[PDB]
């Protein structure tokens with residue numbers, strides 16, 4: 578299995594985001610995705626193959642990352658993949674390497690000050706993301722009703738926000754920072770913390786152990802990488 582196939586290919590294939598500043602953001606001038614998560618991926622490649630250059634990055638989103646893991650087209654996913662009990666039944670997750678929290682991105686012209694001002698709001702969320710469940714509960718805890726519109730990817734939610742087809746775009750603040758602009762704002766409110774793990778197909782206990790041990794045993798190096806990226 579899986580460590581052996583990686584050695585045989587001579588390459589670790591990792592699914593990463595391409596739109597998250599400081600974590601994994603495509604630098605279009607160089608055609609390379611750069612950030613903390615990419616640096617963690619390179620450290621894992623170095624651990625397995627002895628060389629951080631022996632890696633291939635595949636851009637994924639919340640919808641596509643699962644299927645690419647399922648069919649073996651990536652070996653691991655390091656792509657803001659929130660650990661949840663439901664997801665742990667489907668995939669293996671390492672212990673967390675970082676944590677963020679869900680936020681709300683809204684047009685400045687709405688003059689929303691907090692979620693409490695958003696009764697009746699249509700909130701745009703991604704298909705396959707944790708967001709709908711978390712914001713629903715946040716809203717219920719302060720006694721307001723909201724509705725949701727689901728989208729296949731993040732650029733489409735931002736376009737919906739700009740067109741006023743939704744009243745807010747909700748997801749991890751890490752991701753919202755990749756979409757905020759002069760006409761919009763991320764509210765100060767923070768919601769359910771999102772703990773991110775390195776995700777592997779449930780195929781292979783040995784590889785899951787390797788990856789979990791990696792996060793634990795390279796914790797200091799990973800934390801230093803977070804600092805280098807401003808995290």
Ligand SMILES: N[C@@H](CC(=O)O)C(=O)O
Pocket residue numbers: 638639656657658659660703705706707708748749752771
């Ligand atoms: N972190 C969130 C959103 C995302 O990764 O796109 C999730 O795992 O659903």
Ligand SMILES: [Zn+2]
Pocket residue numbers: 598599754
């Ligand atoms: Zn920044």
Ligand SMILES: [Zn+2]
Pocket residue numbers: 624791794795
């Ligand atoms: Zn090690």
